[PDB]
């Protein structure tokens, strides 16, 4: 069976309880995770240890909090107390865990399922080939010995409009923002990097990225996390918003792909 779970955010107890609910069995089953494995919840260290141990039985995409953790580890960014990352950062296996984390994808594609996953979704300004090329380019910098320089460059809110002509710092910043921070788009597909509210509460003319017809969404189902204020609701056919806000006192959501059956684990907080 194929199971897809939204943002875990250090909620190790809820993750394990949900996996036990579906009797997740590596070797028989595969788990997809939308990223944001870490921060806010208490168990970021246990989450990363467990997810790394799954190997080929897990398909991860990196989220914005996963990248922030790497930036803190590399001395690029300051540690915020509310993220509760210190047990992980001080762990004796931190190097092992974080060198694994930075090698994981930004994009997962299963052609037999016609299924795409990224943390925030797929901008309507990208076709599949462009999304693949952009994921490869950022995965390449994150996997390299020079990854702290990219982590420092990634912070920024511009450019917010895709073009194949983009180059340099702006190109990687857009790619990072599209995969890991996207929520709202202007009508022409341009990213808005400020509004984090639910679609009904956003100011015009902002619309969800998934409300703008895009070539990937027209051919593939898209699963994503990230947008907790969406509460996993309000999406069109073929769009699966799996982040139901577990670390916020919401729920952790698991979707089984074969029958589109949902399983929910209440927050312990
Ligand atoms: O943009 P960004 O990528 O930079 O986001 P972020 O700050 O980096 O953190 P997350 O990536 O984990 O996303 P989030 O959606 O969980 O929280 C991002 C913001 O929504 C807020 N938030 C979460 N749940 C709800 C909700 N139900 N209603 C209204 N606001 C909500 C949360 O109070 C935070 O202020
Ligand atoms: Mn999140
Ligand atoms: Mn996120």
Short mmCIF file of C-alpha atoms and ligand atoms in Angstrom, two decimals:
data_model
loop_
_atom_site.label_atom_id
_atom_site.label_comp_id
_atom_site.label_asym_id
_atom_site.label_seq_id
_atom_site.Cartn_x
_atom_site.Cartn_y
_atom_site.Cartn_z
CA UNK A 1 0.00 0.00 0.00
CA UNK A 2 0.98 3.62 -0.54
CA UNK A 3 0.51 6.06 2.33
CA UNK A 4 0.93 9.84 2.16
CA UNK A 5 1.31 11.90 5.33
CA UNK A 6 1.45 15.69 5.70
CA UNK A 7 3.76 17.90 7.74
CA UNK A 8 5.01 16.06 10.84
CA UNK A 9 6.77 19.01 12.54
CA UNK A 10 8.41 16.94 15.25
CA UNK A 11 5.16 15.16 16.17
CA UNK A 12 6.84 11.78 16.52
CA UNK A 13 4.23 10.21 18.79
CA UNK A 14 1.41 11.10 16.41
CA UNK A 15 3.36 9.87 13.38
CA UNK A 16 3.99 6.45 14.92
CA UNK A 17 0.41 6.18 16.19
CA UNK A 18 -0.93 6.95 12.71
CA UNK A 19 1.41 4.46 11.05
CA UNK A 20 0.34 1.81 13.56
CA UNK A 21 -3.32 2.61 12.76
CA UNK A 22 -2.73 1.68 9.10
CA UNK A 23 -0.33 -1.17 9.99
CA UNK A 24 2.41 0.40 7.89
CA UNK A 25 4.85 -2.38 6.98
CA UNK A 26 8.13 -1.51 5.20
CA UNK A 27 8.66 -4.00 2.39
CA UNK A 28 4.92 -4.21 1.72
CA UNK A 29 4.14 -0.48 1.91
CA UNK A 30 5.72 2.82 0.91
CA UNK A 31 5.33 6.10 2.83
CA UNK A 32 5.38 9.53 1.15
CA UNK A 33 6.05 12.53 3.41
CA UNK A 34 5.36 16.12 2.40
CA UNK A 35 8.33 17.51 4.32
CA UNK A 36 8.58 19.83 7.29
CA UNK A 37 9.62 16.81 9.35
CA UNK A 38 11.07 19.05 12.03
CA UNK A 39 10.38 22.11 14.22
CA UNK A 40 7.69 23.18 16.70
CA UNK A 41 6.78 19.69 17.89
CA UNK A 42 8.96 18.10 20.56
CA UNK A 43 10.39 15.13 18.68
CA UNK A 44 12.33 16.38 15.66
CA UNK A 45 15.28 14.15 16.58
CA UNK A 46 13.18 10.98 16.76
CA UNK A 47 11.33 11.86 13.53
CA UNK A 48 14.55 12.26 11.55
CA UNK A 49 16.07 9.10 13.03
CA UNK A 50 12.98 7.09 12.11
CA UNK A 51 12.45 8.52 8.61
CA UNK A 52 16.11 8.01 7.67
CA UNK A 53 15.86 4.40 8.85
CA UNK A 54 13.06 3.67 6.36
CA UNK A 55 15.37 3.95 3.33
CA UNK A 56 13.60 2.94 0.12
CA UNK A 57 10.31 2.56 2.01
CA UNK A 58 9.97 6.35 2.31
CA UNK A 59 9.76 9.03 -0.41
CA UNK A 60 10.44 12.42 1.20
CA UNK A 61 10.35 15.95 -0.17
CA UNK A 62 12.08 18.75 1.73
CA UNK A 63 10.04 21.58 3.23
CA UNK A 64 10.88 25.11 4.30
CA UNK A 65 11.50 24.09 7.93
CA UNK A 66 13.79 21.27 6.83
CA UNK A 67 15.88 23.79 4.87
CA UNK A 68 15.84 26.20 7.82
CA UNK A 69 17.16 23.43 10.08
CA UNK A 70 20.03 22.85 7.63
CA UNK A 71 20.77 26.59 7.66
CA UNK A 72 20.90 26.61 11.46
CA UNK A 73 23.15 23.54 11.49
CA UNK A 74 25.51 25.20 8.97
CA UNK A 75 25.73 28.42 11.02
CA UNK A 76 23.89 30.41 8.35
CA UNK A 77 20.74 31.20 10.35
CA UNK A 78 19.86 31.79 13.98
CA UNK A 79 18.14 29.14 16.06
CA UNK A 80 14.66 30.22 17.16
CA UNK A 81 13.73 28.78 20.59
CA UNK A 82 10.16 28.05 19.49
CA UNK A 83 11.40 25.58 16.83
CA UNK A 84 12.71 23.22 19.56
CA UNK A 85 15.61 22.05 17.39
CA UNK A 86 18.30 21.95 20.08
CA UNK A 87 18.06 18.20 20.94
CA UNK A 88 18.51 17.37 17.26
CA UNK A 89 21.32 19.91 16.71
CA UNK A 90 23.18 18.59 19.78
CA UNK A 91 22.66 14.91 19.02
CA UNK A 92 25.80 12.82 18.48
CA UNK A 93 24.35 11.67 15.16
CA UNK A 94 23.37 15.16 13.98
CA UNK A 95 25.95 15.09 11.18
CA UNK A 96 24.69 11.70 9.93
CA UNK A 97 21.05 12.80 10.08
CA UNK A 98 21.49 16.22 8.50
CA UNK A 99 23.87 15.09 5.77
CA UNK A 100 21.17 12.56 4.87
CA UNK A 101 18.43 15.18 5.01
CA UNK A 102 20.14 17.60 2.64
CA UNK A 103 20.44 14.81 0.02
CA UNK A 104 16.68 14.23 -0.16
CA UNK A 105 14.54 15.42 -3.07
CA UNK A 106 12.41 18.51 -3.50
CA UNK A 107 10.12 16.64 -5.90
CA UNK A 108 8.76 13.07 -6.08
CA UNK A 109 7.09 11.67 -9.23
CA UNK A 110 5.41 8.28 -9.68
CA UNK A 111 4.41 7.84 -13.32
CA UNK A 112 2.35 4.68 -12.76
CA UNK A 113 0.25 6.50 -10.17
CA UNK A 114 0.38 9.76 -12.18
CA UNK A 115 1.27 11.33 -8.85
CA UNK A 116 3.53 14.29 -8.05
CA UNK A 117 4.54 15.50 -4.59
CA UNK A 118 6.32 18.65 -3.44
CA UNK A 119 6.17 20.50 -0.13
CA UNK A 120 4.13 23.49 -1.32
CA UNK A 121 2.82 22.13 -4.63
CA UNK A 122 3.69 22.85 -8.28
CA UNK A 123 3.52 26.43 -9.49
CA UNK A 124 1.19 26.76 -12.52
CA UNK A 125 4.09 28.51 -14.27
CA UNK A 126 5.95 25.17 -14.52
CA UNK A 127 5.46 22.21 -16.79
CA UNK A 128 6.74 18.85 -15.61
CA UNK A 129 10.08 19.02 -17.42
CA UNK A 130 10.82 22.44 -15.91
CA UNK A 131 9.83 21.28 -12.42
CA UNK A 132 12.17 18.28 -12.77
CA UNK A 133 15.06 20.43 -14.00
CA UNK A 134 14.57 22.97 -11.21
CA UNK A 135 14.40 20.29 -8.54
CA UNK A 136 17.58 18.71 -9.89
CA UNK A 137 19.39 22.05 -9.83
CA UNK A 138 18.60 22.85 -6.19
CA UNK A 139 19.08 19.23 -5.09
CA UNK A 140 22.53 19.44 -6.67
CA UNK A 141 23.59 22.44 -4.58
CA UNK A 142 22.08 21.01 -1.38
CA UNK A 143 23.92 17.70 -1.91
CA UNK A 144 27.28 19.37 -2.58
CA UNK A 145 30.07 20.29 -0.18
CA UNK A 146 29.23 23.96 -0.80
CA UNK A 147 25.65 23.73 0.45
CA UNK A 148 26.03 26.46 3.15
CA UNK A 149 26.53 29.10 0.43
CA UNK A 150 23.23 28.11 -1.21
CA UNK A 151 21.41 28.02 2.12
CA UNK A 152 22.49 31.61 2.67
CA UNK A 153 21.37 32.67 -0.79
CA UNK A 154 17.95 31.03 -0.51
CA UNK A 155 16.49 33.66 1.82
CA UNK A 156 14.54 36.27 -0.12
CA UNK A 157 11.15 37.02 -1.59
CA UNK A 158 12.14 37.90 -5.20
CA UNK A 159 12.01 37.19 -8.08
CA UNK A 160 8.43 35.92 -7.89
CA UNK A 161 7.79 35.33 -11.62
CA UNK A 162 9.25 32.33 -13.46
CA UNK A 163 11.16 32.67 -16.71
CA UNK A 164 13.55 30.22 -18.40
CA UNK A 165 15.82 33.28 -18.70
CA UNK A 166 16.27 33.54 -14.92
CA UNK A 167 19.89 33.05 -13.88
CA UNK A 168 22.00 32.96 -10.76
CA UNK A 169 20.80 33.83 -7.28
CA UNK A 170 17.33 34.83 -8.48
CA UNK A 171 16.79 31.53 -10.28
CA UNK A 172 17.59 29.41 -7.22
CA UNK A 173 15.60 31.69 -4.90
CA UNK A 174 12.50 31.41 -7.08
CA UNK A 175 12.87 27.62 -7.31
CA UNK A 176 13.20 27.31 -3.53
CA UNK A 177 10.20 29.56 -2.94
CA UNK A 178 8.01 27.74 -5.49
CA UNK A 179 8.73 24.31 -4.01
CA UNK A 180 8.75 25.18 -0.30
CA UNK A 181 6.91 28.48 0.41
CA UNK A 182 4.19 28.87 -2.27
CA UNK A 183 0.57 29.40 -1.30
CA UNK A 184 -1.10 32.22 -3.24
CA UNK A 185 -0.60 33.34 -6.83
CA UNK A 186 -1.58 36.42 -8.76
CA UNK A 187 -3.77 35.70 -11.81
CA UNK A 188 -0.71 35.42 -14.07
CA UNK A 189 0.82 32.78 -11.77
CA UNK A 190 3.31 35.05 -10.01
CA UNK A 191 4.02 34.05 -6.41
CA UNK A 192 2.84 36.07 -3.41
CA UNK A 193 5.27 35.54 -0.51
CA UNK A 194 3.30 37.32 2.24
CA UNK A 195 -0.21 35.94 2.72
CA UNK A 196 -0.47 32.71 4.75
CA UNK A 197 -4.23 32.78 5.42
CA UNK A 198 -7.00 30.52 4.13
CA UNK A 199 -8.26 31.17 0.58
CA UNK A 200 -11.52 32.71 1.81
CA UNK A 201 -9.55 35.18 3.96
CA UNK A 202 -6.99 36.28 1.38
CA UNK A 203 -7.19 39.70 -0.31
CA UNK A 204 -8.09 39.93 -3.98
CA UNK A 205 -6.81 39.19 -6.54
CA UNK A 206 -4.87 36.42 -4.75
CA UNK A 207 -5.93 32.85 -5.51
CA UNK A 208 -4.49 29.49 -4.46
CA UNK A 209 -1.79 28.17 -6.77
CA UNK A 210 -4.00 25.14 -7.40
CA UNK A 211 -6.89 27.37 -8.60
CA UNK A 212 -4.85 28.45 -11.65
CA UNK A 213 -4.76 25.89 -14.48
CA UNK A 214 -1.27 24.53 -14.90
CA UNK A 215 0.13 21.81 -17.15
CA UNK A 216 1.32 19.54 -14.33
CA UNK A 217 -1.98 19.68 -12.46
CA UNK A 218 -3.85 18.96 -15.69
CA UNK A 219 -2.03 15.62 -16.17
CA UNK A 220 -1.00 14.54 -12.66
CA UNK A 221 -2.46 14.37 -9.19
CA UNK A 222 -0.51 16.65 -6.83
CA UNK A 223 -0.03 15.92 -3.14
CA UNK A 224 1.47 18.60 -0.93
CA UNK A 225 1.67 19.82 2.63
CA UNK A 226 2.82 23.21 3.93
CA UNK A 227 -0.40 25.25 3.85
CA UNK A 228 -1.81 24.53 7.29
CA UNK A 229 -4.41 27.32 7.17
CA UNK A 230 -6.02 25.46 4.26
CA UNK A 231 -6.86 22.74 6.83
CA UNK A 232 -6.68 20.19 4.01
CA UNK A 233 -9.97 21.52 2.58
CA UNK A 234 -11.14 23.43 -0.45
CA UNK A 235 -9.08 21.76 -3.15
CA UNK A 236 -10.19 20.65 -6.63
CA UNK A 237 -10.18 17.09 -7.91
CA UNK A 238 -6.67 15.69 -8.12
CA UNK A 239 -5.19 18.07 -5.52
CA UNK A 240 -4.43 16.62 -2.08
CA UNK A 241 -3.65 19.11 0.70
CA UNK A 242 -2.33 16.82 3.43
CA UNK A 243 -1.16 19.36 6.07
CA UNK A 244 -3.91 19.46 8.69
CA UNK A 245 -1.77 21.23 11.30
CA UNK A 246 -0.76 18.53 13.76
CA UNK A 247 1.88 20.67 15.50
CA UNK A 248 -0.74 23.45 15.88
CA UNK A 249 -3.17 21.26 17.79
CA UNK A 250 -4.88 20.05 14.62
CA UNK A 251 -4.45 16.54 13.24
CA UNK A 252 -1.95 14.42 11.38
CA UNK A 253 -3.51 13.11 8.16
CA UNK A 254 -2.64 9.97 6.21
CA UNK A 255 -4.05 9.17 2.78
CA UNK A 256 -3.89 5.65 1.36
CA UNK A 257 -3.49 6.03 -2.39
CA UNK A 258 -5.08 2.81 -3.64
CA UNK A 259 -8.56 3.55 -2.22
CA UNK A 260 -8.15 7.26 -1.34
CA UNK A 261 -9.00 6.37 2.24
CA UNK A 262 -8.10 8.92 4.90
CA UNK A 263 -6.84 8.14 8.41
CA UNK A 264 -6.46 10.85 11.05
CA UNK A 265 -4.45 11.07 14.28
CA UNK A 266 -5.50 13.80 16.72
CA UNK A 267 -2.80 16.09 18.05
CA UNK A 268 -1.57 15.25 21.54
CA UNK A 269 -0.95 18.94 22.27
O1 LIG B 1 4.93 30.93 4.59
P1 LIG B 1 6.00 30.13 5.23
O2 LIG B 1 6.40 29.04 4.32
O3 LIG B 1 7.30 31.02 5.50
O4 LIG B 1 5.46 29.50 6.59
P2 LIG B 1 6.24 29.17 7.95
O5 LIG B 1 6.03 30.29 8.90
O6 LIG B 1 7.68 29.05 7.64
O7 LIG B 1 5.73 27.78 8.57
P3 LIG B 1 5.09 26.50 7.84
O8 LIG B 1 5.80 26.28 6.56
O9 LIG B 1 5.21 25.28 8.68
O10 LIG B 1 3.54 26.76 7.55
P4 LIG B 1 2.22 26.80 8.46
O11 LIG B 1 1.07 27.02 7.55
O12 LIG B 1 2.20 25.62 9.35
O13 LIG B 1 2.44 28.08 9.39
C1 LIG B 1 2.52 29.39 8.79
C2 LIG B 1 1.55 30.31 9.49
O14 LIG B 1 0.21 29.79 9.36
C3 LIG B 1 -0.43 29.93 10.61
N1 LIG B 1 -1.55 29.00 10.68
C4 LIG B 1 -1.49 27.64 10.86
N2 LIG B 1 -2.66 27.06 10.91
C5 LIG B 1 -3.56 28.10 10.75
C6 LIG B 1 -4.97 28.14 10.71
N3 LIG B 1 -5.75 27.06 10.85
N4 LIG B 1 -5.55 29.35 10.53
C7 LIG B 1 -4.78 30.43 10.40
N5 LIG B 1 -3.44 30.51 10.43
C8 LIG B 1 -2.89 29.31 10.61
C9 LIG B 1 0.66 29.71 11.66
O15 LIG B 1 0.31 30.36 12.88
C10 LIG B 1 1.88 30.35 10.99
O16 LIG B 1 2.12 31.67 11.47
MN1 LIG B 2 4.64 23.07 8.01
MN1 LIG B 3 5.98 24.53 5.16
#
